[PDB]
């Protein structure tokens, strides 16, 4: 029920992302009252217990912190930016915008695999990393 930590102030999120060491800071931009964003928050809550050792999730509200809306072009719901090691990582998953996941993951295990791949890429030092599962298609059929 959206009990994850939330950035009341915009600058607080900035220093929270800055205060990172050997961990990935998943800043989930959006609004809790949105239904798709509610599903994304529920998925993040489910993941949080399993991967709290290196993956920290820290939500934020666009209305509360609108200064970062124009910084990374935050104009969609469910947006996720893996701002890790003080470096905005390039997560490529077969999408045009390979630096933003703006829709709730269908399954928790997929998100866990994605976040651990992001951690591996960040620790290796590369600023870009690909996804084992391409999302160019939704596998609707």
């Amino acid at each position: 029920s959206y009990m994850l930590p939330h950035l009341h102030n915009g600058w607080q999120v900035d220093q929270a992302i800055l205060s990172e060491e050997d961990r990935v800071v998943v800043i989930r931009f959006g609004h809790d009252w949105d239904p798709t964003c509610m599903k994304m928050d529920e998925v993040l809550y489910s993941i949080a217990e399993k991967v709290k050792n290196f993956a920290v999730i820290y939500l934020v509200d666009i209305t509360e912190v609108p200064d970062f809306n124009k910084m990374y072009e935050l104009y969609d719901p469910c947006t996720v930016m893996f701002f890790f090691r003080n470096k905005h990582i390039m997560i490529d998953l077969g999408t045009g915008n390979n630096n933003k996941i703006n829709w709730a993951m269908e399954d928790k295990q997929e998100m866990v695999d994605i976040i651990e791949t992001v951690y591996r890429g960040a620790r290796k030092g590369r600023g870009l990393v690909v996804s084992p599962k391409d999302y160019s298609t939704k596998y609707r059929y």
Binding site: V112, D113, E116, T117, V130, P132
Partner: protein, 570 residues
């Protein structure tokens, strides 16, 4: 069963394979354009080896074994499972990277000359792996250096005064247009050049032009499934580059060469030096045959596509090897049955006690001037309820252990063992030593002589110690002047002993028999006198050949007898 079974109408191997689907494969492959037609778009021409048949395709690589053993995570499991897709997509690069297929904006890699239409992450990553570390610039430098060396070597007939290269910009190797000339060649006074043409032409009229300079350009291109026409590409590229404002050529007369890497095809177009056209054709063929960077690229392709080179056939024959045994630097042979030999008791009513004798394999090495006695405990040699296969598996570990203890140079370069069935585990054991090789031994050493000989028979009992023992070579071999024929003299007596041990002792001269030295398990030989004694031993085989085989004792030829002594026949 938790999985669906489509073949529930009838059970396999119970109602039989009702549907015969054998001609379907042939019909499909031939209707697709034949084997060659299918392979024409599969980078097969990118490998110089004509592995049309006999090539091995590694379905599972070492990375698969590492992933299976390491108990990989979910993302690691997905990465390991996404390997064969990359494999065949690289294997299908020509027909999948065409121009009509995947229309859109063309794009080349970071520092190479491969144009790809539509972003294909698998092909992109495979290409940047294959062309890692400026491989395009490396192959361009290799080909230009080979051309320069070839031209310099034959500079006499070509009247070459200077053969140099310009200060080519590093990025000008993979550039679309050859703005900078590759090789410049200035002659002495004059140089007659004919009209531009292709290398397939024969006619020439050198009076077309007379220039004192000449240029040679190498075009590194990656042919697709539809743009693999080297000759047409060579013509078009020569016409475009020669007739262009951007391109700067110090000489207006010259020839441009082109190499299709994917097609591995060499071509050229333009003018020629008088009499150099066959020379340039032969030089291009020879360089493309064994170019260093090209060979490295081919090996990289073979590894990346998991297409292992067709395995060579080991010289299982040993008739030539027996004569050239002294020529081999290091060689050894071991009898598998000797290690697994078990003495059997005899009783009218009691059960026969087929207890193991010893772990020694009666190994020998005539080229090394000694023998190996891998003496092991009888119980260690053969355990309780131990099958022959189990003993062979344990013997293979001990066989590799003997090679492991010995130095690599001292280890047998060729392990010629007549036991073909046991050769494969030995060959599998030989995989621990890639430098050493294992070759089949058509000639079979009569290891039964050691069992027949009481001194070695006592040594078999003395081999019950688990520690390895030292088996000195026969004194007859040392007594013989020729080390190459030393084995033959020993084998001739040994072969007769295997056929008839008691007759061999009588046939062997007592003077040669009672010449045992402390430095040798077997006694010495009185040079030519031993051959006379060995003639009776040879006659013993001849008597066996005369009585058993239809050919008489005299009919048994010495050449065949020597092969029979060495066991050349199967």
């Amino acid at each position: 069963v938790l999985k669906q079974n489509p073949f529930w109408w009838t059970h396999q191997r119970h109602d039989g394979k009702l549907w015969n689907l054998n001609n379907y494969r042939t019909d499909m492959i031939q209707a697709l354009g034949g084997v060659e037609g299918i392979l024409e778009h599969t980078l097969f021409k990118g490998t110089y080896f004509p592995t049309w048949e006999g090539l091995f395709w590694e379905k599972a690589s070492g990375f698969e074994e590492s992933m299976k053993w390491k108990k990989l995570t979910n993302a690691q499991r997905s990465g390991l499972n996404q390997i064969p897709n990359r494999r065949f997509t690289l294997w299908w690069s020509p027909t999948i990277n065409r121009a009509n297929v995947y229309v859109g904006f063309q794009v080349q890699l970071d520092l190479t000359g491969i144009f790809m239409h539509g972003k294909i992450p698998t092909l992109k990553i495979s290409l940047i792996q294959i062309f890692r570390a400026h491989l395009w610039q490396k192959i361009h430098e290799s080909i230009v250096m080979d051309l320069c060396q070839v031209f310099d070597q034959e500079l006499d007939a070509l009247e070459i005064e200077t053969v140099q290269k310009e200060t080519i910009h590093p990025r000008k190797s993979y550039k679309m247009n050859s703005s900078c000339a590759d090789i410049l060649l200035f002659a002495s006074y004059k140089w007659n050049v004919s009209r531009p043409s292709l290398l397939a032409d024969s006619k020439d009229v050198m009076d077309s032009t007379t220039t004192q300079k000449y240029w040679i350009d190498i075009q590194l291109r990656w042919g697709d499934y539809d743009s693999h026409d080297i000759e047409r590409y060579a013509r078009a590229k020569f016409l475009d580059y020669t007739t262009d404002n951007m391109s700067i050529y110090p000489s207006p007369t010259g020839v441009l060469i082109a190499i299709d890497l994917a097609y591995n095809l060499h071509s050229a177009y333009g003018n020629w030096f008088p009499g150099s056209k066959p020379l340039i054709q032969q030089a291009m063929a020879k360089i493309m045959k064994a170019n260093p960077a090209l060979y490295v690229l081919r090996e990289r392709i073979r590894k990346g596509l998991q297409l292992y080179s067709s395995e060579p056939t080991e010289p299982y024959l040993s008739s030539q090897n027996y004569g050239e045994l002294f020529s081999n630097q290091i060689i050894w042979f071991v009898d598998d049955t000797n290690v697994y030999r078990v003495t059997i008791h005899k009783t009218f009513e009691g059960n026969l006690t087929t207890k193991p004798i010893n772990g020694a394999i009666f190994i020998f090495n005539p080229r090394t001037g000694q023998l190996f006695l891998k003496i092991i405990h009888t119980s260690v040699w053969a355990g309780q309820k131990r099958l022959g296969q189990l003993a062979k598996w344990k013997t293979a570990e001990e066989v590799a252990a003997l090679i492991r203890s010995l130095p690599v140079e001292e280890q047998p370069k060729q392990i010629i063992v007549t036991r073909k069935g046991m050769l494969d585990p030995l060959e599998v054991h030989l995989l621990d030593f890639p430098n050493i090789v294992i070759k089949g031994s058509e000639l079979q050493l009569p290891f039964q002589a050691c069992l027949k000989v009481e001194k070695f028979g006592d040594l078999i009992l003395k081999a019950t110690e688990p520690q390895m023992v030292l088996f000195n070579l026969y004194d007859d071999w040392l007594k013989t002047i020729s080390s190459y024929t030393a084995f033959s003299r020993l084998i001739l007596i040994l072969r007769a002993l295997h056929v008839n041990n008691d007759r061999a002792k009588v046939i062997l001269k007592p003077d040669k028999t009672t010449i045992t030295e402390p430095h040798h398990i077997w006694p010495t030989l009185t040079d030519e006198e031993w051959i006379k004694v060995e003639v009776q031993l040879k006659d013993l085989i001849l008597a066996d050949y005369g009585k058993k085989n239809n050919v008489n004792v005299a009919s048994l030829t010495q050449s065949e007898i020597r092969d029979i002594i060495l066991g050349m026949e199967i």
